[PDB]
Amino acid sequence: FXXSXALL
């Protein structure tokens, strides 16, 4: 969840 792990 919350995108790819780049930002979150």
Author numbering: 1 to 8
The authors write:
Novo29 is an eight-residue depsipeptide comprising a macrolactone ring and a linear tail.
The crystallographic phases were determined using single-wavelength anomalous diffraction (SAD) phasing from the incorporated iodide ions. Further optimization in a 24-well plate format afforded long rectangular crystals suitable for X-ray diffraction from 2.8 M sodium acetate at pH 6.6. The asymmetric unit contains two molecules of epi-Novo29, which exhibit only minor differences in conformation. In the X-ray crystallographic structure, epi-Novo29 adopts an amphiphilic conformation, with the side chains of Phe1, d-Leu2, Leu7, and Leu8 creating a hydrophobic surface and the side chains of d-Lys3, Ser4, and (2R,3S)-hydroxyAsn5, as well as the N-terminal ammonium group, creating a hydrophilic surface. An intramolecular hydrogen bond between the main-chain NH group of Ala6 and the side chain OH group of Ser4 helps enforce this conformation. In the lattice, epi-Novo29 packs so that the hydrophobic surfaces come together, with four sets of epi-Novo29 molecules forming a hydrophobic core. The macrolactone ring of epi-Novo29 adopts a conformation in which the main-chain NH groups of (2R,3S)-hydroxyAsn5, Ala6, Leu7, and Leu8 converge to create a cavity, which binds ordered water and acetate anion. In contrast, epi-Novo29 exhibited no MIC activity (>32 μg/mL) against any of the bacteria, thus indicating that the 2R,3R stereochemistry of the hydroxyAsn residue is critical to the antibiotic activity of Novo29.
